[PDB]
Structure 1
Amino acid sequence: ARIAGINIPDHKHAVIALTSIYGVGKTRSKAILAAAGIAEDVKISELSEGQIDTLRDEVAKFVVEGDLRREISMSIKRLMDLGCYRGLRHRRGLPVRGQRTKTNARTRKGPRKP
């Protein structure tokens, strides 16, 4: 379909198909389909048009793909221009939740190139 901007999976059940949107995982998607009155075991191909529309206003209640990314990136930019401790580690690129850096943190630091 085109749920909340993108959503073209098929052959998947609707709880898993809905999780393609940036902003919904397994438990938010269950909250969508419960409020839409849709069974979770249906594919998107077997969805009528009278069901796809009542998901679009249902998914519109949660901040999703478009305006979520600019929300998250501004909050990082709120920290990085604040000069705080978490913003300072966001600048250099290093783990910000207070975990070790002597041997680990390959995720923040990328590969060990030299």
Structure 2
Amino acid sequence: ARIAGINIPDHKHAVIALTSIYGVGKTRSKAILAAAGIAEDVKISELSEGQIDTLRDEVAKFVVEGDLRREISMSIKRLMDLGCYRGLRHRRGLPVRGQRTKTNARTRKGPRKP
């Protein structure tokens, strides 16, 4: 339970545990476990060292937590330093893809100020 540099949980099935990797959801998790050949309903606790090692290799073949953070943050910074419309929206902390901001922009603006 030390895949990709995190401490993926015990007592959870393989899919649910590998969901905890920042960059692996349900689909990528099941793809990794299928490539590794293990049944999907078995806990991480009862996975042997070699099986965990091939899981680590496949996760490394995919993108990992800190790496994914690095590219997503550089893409955001790329938008900002281009100063496109999306760069302006990211800088301002307003919705970027064209939602209404007269109302319903709270998840992007934070709670109401006054």
Q: TM-score, normalised by structure 2?
A: 0.97
Deviation of 1:8 after TM superposition, in Å, equals 3.1
Deviation of 1:99 after TM superposition, in Å, equals 0.7
Q: Distance in 1 between matches of 2:27 and 2:83?
A: 35
* Mapped contact 1:79–1:87 kept (Cα < 8 A): yes
Q: Distance in 2 between matches of 1:50 and 1:91?
A: 46
Q: Aligned residues, how many?
A: 114
* Mapped contact 1:7–1:17 kept (Cα < 8 A): no
CA RMSD of aligned residues (A): 0.8
Deviation of 1:27 after TM superposition, in Å, equals 0.3
SS at match of 2:43: coil
Task: Provide structure 1 residue ranges, at least 5 long, that are not aligned to the other structure.
Answer: none
Q: Deviation above 4 Å: which 4+ runs of structure 1?
A: none
* Mapped contact 1:14–1:43 kept (Cα < 8 A): yes
Deviations 1:42-98 (CA, angstroms, capped at 9, x unpaired): 001111112111100011111120111010000000000001000000001100010
* Mapped contact 2:8–2:21 kept (Cα < 8 A): no
Q: TM-score, normalised by structure 1?
A: 0.97
* Mapped contact 2:86–2:96 kept (Cα < 8 A): yes
Task: Provide structure 2 residue ranges, at least 5 long, that are not aligned to the other structure.
Answer: none
Deviation of 1:22 after TM superposition, in Å, equals 0.3
SS at match of 1:111: coil
